[PDB]
Amino acid sequence: GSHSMRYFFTSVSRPGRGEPRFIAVGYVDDTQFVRFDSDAASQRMEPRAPWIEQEGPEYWDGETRKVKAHSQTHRVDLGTLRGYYNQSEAGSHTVQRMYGCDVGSDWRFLRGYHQYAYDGKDYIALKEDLRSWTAADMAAQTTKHKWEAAHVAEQLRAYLEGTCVEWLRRYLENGKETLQRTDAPKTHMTHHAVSDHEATLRCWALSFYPAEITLTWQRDGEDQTQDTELVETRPAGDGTFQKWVAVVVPSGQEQRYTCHVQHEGLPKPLTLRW
């Protein structure tokens, strides 16, 4: 299927003393592969996936040069936004940025992104066609006009449709053991009595990759949501993910209930019966 490369940048001002905390992480799909932290000792972009370790020193010097340039930019941007929003120098404020690209199964550019939030709210974002901007408010209209006047979209597009996908292609090849492997969920169902007259069925999906998954209960062939409980999908810590969904049913009636699992690593959905 498709694959995505994503970069997430967070910059938080520290008005008590010093410059903003800046954290940048790079992802291919649900796998982190690089990180930069302004409060870490290296002051370098660092490897977070074995397959990125194959890149030599020129890559790391390049990535470090750029990531630090990004840091300064966010630093300047926080200053800029505090001004736009007439905020005092005394509050702590946050800038968040995300950009990246997807390739389809044909390995070609499919989609690109570039979006910006201030203090946890939409600020400005590049539209799907990568030619124009979505400005959330009047402050953002300033950014929109400046960026349109300086043809930033075009430059961004050239990256997202070009060099962005070239890197993604390269990473997918070099890390093919893991990046292009799908780990189908290991599923089982547990049963516990909660009374003399009803029981809890819990259907588990463990150790799957990627994170995207659908778990649903059926009763006599129909979706059931009443009397169900679930958890949001969670990282297992070893690079895989976990989820369960539970239902409470009259003791003796378990045969009615089926758990349904959909995941990219499964040719067909799974059905589990007690």
């Binding site: 982190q32 968040q96 969670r234 990282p235 810590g237």
Partner: protein, 100 residues
């Protein structure tokens, strides 16, 4: 300033069996701002040298972090995770229920 309280999930990496090495996780998500304190507890005492993922965020700009440490379940030990955040009047402590 938009503020969102952290959702908290405390759980083990592998199915929990007494005396068998495992990993204790505390997954915090959906929060803003990002400054947050998160500790893993053993019988109420802070576990030292807990590690955590690098700060990242979801499509809705809410942050998420994973805190984790190696541990060995027993029948006698209790574990929990303790999260403090600006949105919380005092540290929130969530107890680990095995096979939660």
């Amino acid at each position: 300033m938009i503020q969102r309280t952290p959702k908290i999930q405390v759980y083990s990496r592998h199915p929990a069996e007494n005396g068998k090495s495992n990993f204790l996780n505390c997954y915090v998500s959906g929060f803003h701002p990002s400054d947050i304190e998160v500790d893993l507890l053993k019988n109420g005492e802070r576990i030292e040298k807990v590690e955590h993922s690098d700060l990242s965020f979801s499509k809705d700009w809410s942050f998420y972090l994973l805190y984790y440490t190696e541990f060995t379940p027993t029948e006698k030990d209790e574990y929990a995770c303790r999260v403090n955040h600006v949105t919380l009047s005092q540290p929130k402590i969530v107890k680990w229920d095995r096979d939660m």
